Amino acid sequence: EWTGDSSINYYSDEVISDFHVGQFNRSAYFCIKTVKKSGEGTPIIACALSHDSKWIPSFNIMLEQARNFYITGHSIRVYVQPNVWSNKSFIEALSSNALVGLSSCSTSECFGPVK
Amino acid sequence: EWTGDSSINYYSDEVISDFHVGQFNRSAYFCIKTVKKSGEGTPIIACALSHDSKWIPSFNIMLEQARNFYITGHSIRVYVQPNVWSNKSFIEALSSNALVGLSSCSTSECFGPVK
Amino acid sequence: EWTGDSSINYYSDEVISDFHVGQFNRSAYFCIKTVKKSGEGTPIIACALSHDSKWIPSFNIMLEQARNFYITGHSIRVYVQPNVWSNKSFIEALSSNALVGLSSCSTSECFGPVK
Amino acid sequence: EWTGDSSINYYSDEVISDFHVGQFNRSAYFCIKTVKKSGEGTPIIACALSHDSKWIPSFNIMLEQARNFYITGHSIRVYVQPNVWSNKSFIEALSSNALVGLSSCSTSECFGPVK
Amino acid sequence: EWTGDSSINYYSDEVISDFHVGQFNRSAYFCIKTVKKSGEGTPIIACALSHDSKWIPSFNIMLEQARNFYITGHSIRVYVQPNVWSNKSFIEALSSNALVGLSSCSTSECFGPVK
Amino acid sequence: IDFVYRVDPNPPDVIFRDGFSLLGYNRDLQQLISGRSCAGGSSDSRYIVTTSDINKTYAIARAYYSHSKFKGNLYRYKIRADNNFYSLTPSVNYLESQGGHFNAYEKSMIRLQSEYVSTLSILPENIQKAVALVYDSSTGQIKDGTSTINTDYVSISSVSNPGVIPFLPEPQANTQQRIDAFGSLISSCFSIYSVCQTHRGQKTEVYKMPFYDARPVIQFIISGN
């Protein structure tokens, strides 16, 4: 139940390009679309729901951090857990990845748990 | 329901021009008025209430978001649900459109659910 | 039960000039002073308390909006309910009005309920 | 029981020079050290605890206003209650004064209760 | 029980260089990596968990204070408690230190408890 | 980007011959981003700041129009960017690497502005067209009006300089200075008096825009509250 498990995939040097907020069922949610600051590769979409999944306790710490990184535009590392959301419309629209971690990324090395 | 459900309209490339806050009955509320733009696209007025609607769990997430969209002046996409507010005076002064989603626009397309 | 009744007064074109925060009888409170548009009239002071009167639900949203309008100095409309805060020293010190609403003002028209 | 009470000492035209946060027992505390703008007197320290003394309701509003005043570095008036904290090590490293109020100073006059 | 205790270590003239947020066993956590100015070396990593250790009541106060200290990038003093987190994977990933206090440094003398 | 935009109240018949001129000789990047060298400060910047996002120009026009005592008419001039136009992000990274600090307040400010700085004066042949923004006061709308076209467009079809501003002054440490902004978090160096508004000696009599410190506003949007 940690943002360091083998089941968590992280993408470094991401920059949060687009933000979205809404409500699914009875839970607020926010999705971040991050594009690599290279121009190669598909964007990474990570969503967090206020009252769903095992990542509820960190939702309020990921909403103000992504918004911190979206406004600043700093290069970041996104830790997501795939195949969390099940409502087909939700994955087909936004994503199935769950935003479970955010870290600050520097030029040489980038913070947070690795591997 | 969901922000991207079928019964939800959305208006893209809109800029929040006017912000209003207050209280209705025993629930805090905020309304956003978008720029008139051009053509026949009359300004969209979307209000969200803190303790009376059905979009309660997301009221805060719009509130902090719309404000930062009002302050930054970013072109965004508004997901609103019509005929939610039923008070005649409220519909006359403000609108009956419930603010149910906010998305960041990046010209070309806008992030978030469509159709 | 709304910032649109006949009992609610509103002053448009105002600019929040001064901000004050404190506690009054285990109730946090904030007062805003608008100095603009003095003329022959006195600056308008509006005070909102965290656990007093019927405007408790909208205390936080009013506080955030007042801070936002103070740090930007934007011309805004203040909705106040006169003749509250029956403490004599509180009235003689800050005001007897309750900050019930804040709206954005744009020269020609102002958002929010009128009349 | 009130920020503008007779037991409260107010110091006007005091910019918040240093900020400190921590935990005392089971209460989060924040302390601000303010010095005179025109190099006068002695720089006074005011501390607020999240779960101690009778100033609990205003701890959050005081914390946010102190943070805002520290970011802007504006000339502001502090309202402190002397002899509130009792533990000896806290008085040696910080003040016994409780931060009970904050108001903005606008050139000649300052907002907030006086005398 | 206090950030000024003898068991608490502190490092002055630090600048928060890296930030990380995540979840760990139903507890939201954030870690800050602070580096000595001028680049002497030995970065200090301090983590705070929302629902672990004895430092829950000051978690949020250190979160929004670290973020601000990360936003401004000012010289700050970090008060940490060594050997708080016990999970070996977490210890090797980020740190075992607990973020217990944050202070502002004015390059003359850091404001806070000293030892 | 290929085309930048600048809001100026002078009519196109005088801009197409005079253009935009440098204020002074303050080449400091730290002062320009926060506006200390622009109209909110010493008013001697060596850079002319233009935005590439069309919505930012609408923001400037809205801020100046919905102000109740700005008596004038605004024109949005589109300018062909050339090798003298620089994005502020490549130079911020370089300046921060030579022994300088750009806090998240000045990092979140360029992201909101899409600023492009011209080191020299914007020559009249760099402006292609001028759209007369019309302010319907009764409706309260800013709409594109008569879009005149300059006849001096060279049409080389060049691009901006993707490098760093040459000869950047060494950054100053421990600045602790305010960031001047107006309207919906529109930076300084975008206002009317943020360029040389003195043609043939006389000065256009329009409002002096009041600038607020952007740092509390950027913190407000970042922290959400």
Author numbering:
A (entry chain F), B (entry chain E), C (entry chain D), D (entry chain C), E (entry chain G): 1 to 115
F (entry chain B): 6 to 230
Task: Reproduce, without paraphrasing, sentences from the article in which this PDB structure was first reported.
To validate the structural insights from the cryo-EM map of the endogenously expressed DiaT holotoxin, we recombinantly expressed PltBd1 homopentameric holotoxin, PltBd2 homopentameric holotoxin, and PltBd1/PltBd2 heteropentameric holotoxin in E. coli. Cryo-EM analysis resolved these structures at resolutions of 3.05 Å, 2.61 Å, and 2.94 Å, respectively. Pore radius measurements confirmed that the PltBd1 homopentamer exhibits the smallest pore radius with significant distortion, while the PltBd2 homopentamer displays a larger and straighter pore. Further analysis of PltA’s interactions with distinct B subunits identified a critical hydrophobic interaction between Ile227 of PltA and Ile71 of PltBd2. Additionally, Tyr70 in PltBd1 forms stable polar interactions with Asn230 in PltA, contributing to the narrow, contracted pore structure, a feature absents in the PltBd2 homopentamer. All holotoxins demonstrated cytotoxic activity, but the PltBd2 homopentamer exhibited the highest potency, approximately threefold greater than the PltBd1/PltBd2 heteropentameric toxin (DiaT) and nearly 75-fold greater than the PltBd1 homopentamer. Despite its potent intoxication potential, the PltBd2 homopentameric holotoxin failed to restore cytotoxicity in the pltBd1 and pltBd2 double deletion strain complemented with pltBd2 alone. This suggests that PltBd2 homopentamers are likely unable to mediate extracellular secretion. The lower average dissociation constant exhibited by PltBd2 suggests a higher affinity for these glycans than PltBd1. Conversely, PltBd2 features a valine residue at the corresponding position (triangle, 6E and S12), limiting its binding capacity for Neu5Gc-terminated glycans, akin to PltB in typhoid toxin.
In this study, we identified and characterized a typhoid toxin-like A2B5 toxin, designated diarizonae toxin (DiaT), as a key virulence factor in Salmonella diarizonae. The DiaT genomic islet encodes two distinct B subunits, PltBd1 and PltBd2, which exhibit unique functional roles. Through genetic and functional analyses, we demonstrate that the heteropentameric assembly of PltBd1 and PltBd2 is essential for cytotoxicity, with our data suggesting PltBd1 facilitates toxin secretion and PltBd2 mediates host cell targeting. The holotoxin consists of a pentameric B subunit arrangement supporting a single PltA subunit, with the amphipathic C-terminal tail of PltA extending into the central pore formed by the B subunits.
